[PDB]
Design a protein around this nucleic acid. Structure first.
Lengths: 85, 85
DNA sequence: AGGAACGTTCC
DNA sequence: AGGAACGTTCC
């Protein structure tokens, strides 16, 4: 499995990252309460020289898309995948 | 050792390539009698999707330079390295 | 210098 | 699907 798939899997499951990135109670989406915190505290642990933009691009390559359910907190990010039951 | 270093080493030493690329009798330079033939018959054996330009660029990365000893056959190429005894 | 890790592509 | 090869970077 691709390094990115491995990394995302480990990052969202690893208990030490729970306040920055974790599964929704249904497992349907990955929740990132605060992008800045996530970028500062988790990304550097899995990637060498990367940013949220690069992260989001990689996520797309694997079918993950940003959920747009806000009716006009830009800090909160949530991703769901194109493929589901 | 880098894949390119390995490849060049094997390509210039492998008896099957002798009419296309080989060492000078002194070992000081690599002689390529005819670039077209070399490109058509040897390069495809060691590289996936590459051309003489890309080859020459890689050669430079490792200190090999084209010998310019002609007084005004553009087909003949010869390389010597920056580092010598 | 050389072998362990980590990665991607080949088979 | 999964392991063999091949590569580069890490240690």
């Amino acid at each position: 499995r691709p390094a990115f798939v491995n990394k995302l899997w480990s990052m969202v499951n690893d208990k030490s990252n729970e306040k920055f990135i974790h599964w929704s109670t249904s497992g349907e989406s990955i929740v990132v309460p605060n992008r800045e915190r996530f970028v500062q505290e988790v990304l550097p642990k899995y990637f060498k020289h990367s940013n949220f933009a690069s992260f989001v691009r990689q996520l797309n390559m694997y079918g993950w898309h940003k959920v747009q359910d806000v009716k006009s907190n830009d800090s909160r990010w949530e991703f769901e995948n194109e493929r589901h039951a």
